[PDB]
Amino acid sequence: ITGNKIMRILKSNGLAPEIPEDLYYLIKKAVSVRKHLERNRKDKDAKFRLILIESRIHRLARYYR
Amino acid sequence: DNSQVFGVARIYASFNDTFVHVTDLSGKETIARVTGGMKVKADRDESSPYAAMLAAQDVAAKCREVGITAVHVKIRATGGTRTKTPGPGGQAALRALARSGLRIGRIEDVTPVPSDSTRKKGGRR
RNA sequence: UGAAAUGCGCAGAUACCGGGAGGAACGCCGAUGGCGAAGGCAGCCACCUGGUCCACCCGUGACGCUGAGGCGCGAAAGCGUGGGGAGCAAACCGGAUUAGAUACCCGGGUAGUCCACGCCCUAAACGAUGCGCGCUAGGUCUCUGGGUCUCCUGGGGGCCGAAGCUAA
């Protein structure tokens, strides 16, 4: 993501400590990854990256509340 | 014929035979020699590093009349000889030239290679 | 080739020049190097994409570690359908060697090796060394970042070695 699309997502997410912001960033990155994965099914190594992001998101929600 | 003095020498080695041809700065060949050119018969003449040596010299000497002095050597292909001598086959030619009297400006390996023409046999591939 | 022979060549081979077609691999750089969780990954170009290090210490405020079963990935060979097939080459067909040669050597050669989609799931899958964290002399070479850059500091790769450990 570019265009500071990241920044905009960050700013829009919140003044807060960005745990929720983090959730947003992760969802955004994940979606793109899922998108990437739509193609390049073969790309296993990339998938691993998704594994981390999805994992971290899942974990954060639990930790958060 | 018309003195040149500076030119190119192409050494084309092969497992079968060595053929060297000298050329102008332009690329047009002045003269050429091979193991066949000298009277040596097919097996021995053709490859034998000795032959390559003789051919190299014959090429230079003939070129000397052309008034050749300095030359750029280009090596194409690999090959040599069966002979007991070390017989790199190609190297001897490269040597004979340096010695022949012509000053060799440079030795360059530009052995051509196919993109991938056809399958080689001969235990290759 | 140890010597050879099979083999190819006068329908002209080999060696040489030019043109074309096709497949596979990617010399030098290249390392004693780098990347990845492993398997593994090296022509160049663009796009898509994962991991990772460092500086600032700015934000959250224990959100951490490991992880049975699951799920996924997993060299080669191998399997299914289709494609491709230059070189190589199990099987196979010959030549030689030998006491014999179902081998090693030489000439051929099919599957396969390549691509796609699906399957198989193994290995000396090795560092033969599970993951995380803390603590315990140094020296030397190296890759990558920062610094007040003849050295200090962080991450990685090697060598030698304190204490200690070890049956060695």
Curated annotation (Swiss-Prot), chain A:
The family this protein is said to belong to: Belongs to the universal ribosomal protein uS15 family.
Protein known as: Small ribosomal subunit protein uS15
UniProt function note: Component of the ribosome, a large ribonucleoprotein complex responsible for the synthesis of proteins in the cell. The small ribosomal subunit (SSU) binds messenger RNAs (mRNAs) and translates the encoded message by selecting cognate aminoacyl-transfer RNA (tRNA) molecules. The large subunit (LSU) contains the ribosomal catalytic site termed the peptidyl transferase center (PTC), which catalyzes the formation of peptide bonds, thereby polymerizing the amino acids delivered by tRNAs into a polypeptide chain.
Residue ranges the record marks as coiled coil: none
Source organism superkingdom: Eukaryota
Record note on quaternary structure: Component of the small ribosomal subunit (SSU). Mature yeast ribosomes consist of a small (40S) and a large (60S) subunit. The 40S small subunit contains 1 molecule of ribosomal RNA (18S rRNA) and 33 different proteins (encoded by 57 genes). The large 60S subunit contains 3 rRNA molecules (25S, 5.8S and 5S rRNA) and 46 different proteins (encoded by 81 genes).
Location in or out of the cell: Cytoplasm
Sequence intervals crossing the membrane: none
Gene name of this polypeptide: RPS13
Curated annotation (Swiss-Prot), chain B:
Residues spanning the signal sequence: none
Domain of life: Eukaryota
UniProt modification remark: N-terminally acetylated by acetyltransferase NatA.
Composition bias, Basic residues: 120-125
Pfam family, one: Ribosomal_S11
Alphabetized InterPro entries for the sequence: Ribosomal_uS11, Ribosomal_uS11_CS, Ribosomal_uS11_sf
Transmembrane regions: none
Coiled-coil stretches noted in the UniProt entry, renumbered to this chain: none
GO biological process, alphabetically ordered: cytoplasmic translation; maturation of SSU-rRNA from tricistronic rRNA transcript (SSU-rRNA, 5.8S rRNA, LSU-rRNA); ribosomal small subunit assembly; translation
Region spans: Disordered: 109-125
Annotated keywords: Acetylation, Cytoplasm, Nucleus, Ribonucleoprotein, Ribosomal protein, Ribosome biogenesis, rRNA processing
GO molecular-function terms, A-Z: mRNA binding; structural constituent of ribosome
Subcellular location: Cytoplasm; Nucleus, Nucleolus
Main location: cytoplasm
UniProt GO cellular component terms: 90S preribosome; cytosol; cytosolic small ribosomal subunit; nucleolus; nucleoplasm; small-subunit processome
Keyword match Cytoplasm: yes
Assigned protein family: Belongs to the universal ribosomal protein uS11 family.
Function field: Component of the ribosome, a large ribonucleoprotein complex responsible for the synthesis of proteins in the cell. The small ribosomal subunit (SSU) binds messenger RNAs (mRNAs) and translates the encoded message by selecting cognate aminoacyl-transfer RNA (tRNA) molecules. The large subunit (LSU) contains the ribosomal catalytic site termed the peptidyl transferase center (PTC), which catalyzes the formation of peptide bonds, thereby polymerizing the amino acids delivered by tRNAs into a polypeptide chain.
Note: Present with 29600 molecules/cell in log phase SD medium. There are 2 genes for uS11 in yeast.
Subunit details: Component of the small ribosomal subunit (SSU). Mature yeast ribosomes consist of a small (40S) and a large (60S) subunit. The 40S small subunit contains 1 molecule of ribosomal RNA (18S rRNA) and 33 different proteins (encoded by 57 genes). The large 60S subunit contains 3 rRNA molecules (25S, 5.8S and 5S rRNA) and 46 different proteins (encoded by 81 genes). uS11 interacts with eS1 forming part of the mRNA exit tunnel. uS11 interacts with snoRNA U3. uS11 interacts with MPP10. Component of the ribosomal small subunit (SSU) processome composed of at least 40 protein subunits and snoRNA U3.
Protein name: Small ribosomal subunit protein uS11A
Organism the protein comes from: Saccharomyces cerevisiae (strain ATCC 204508 / S288c)
Gene field: RPS14A
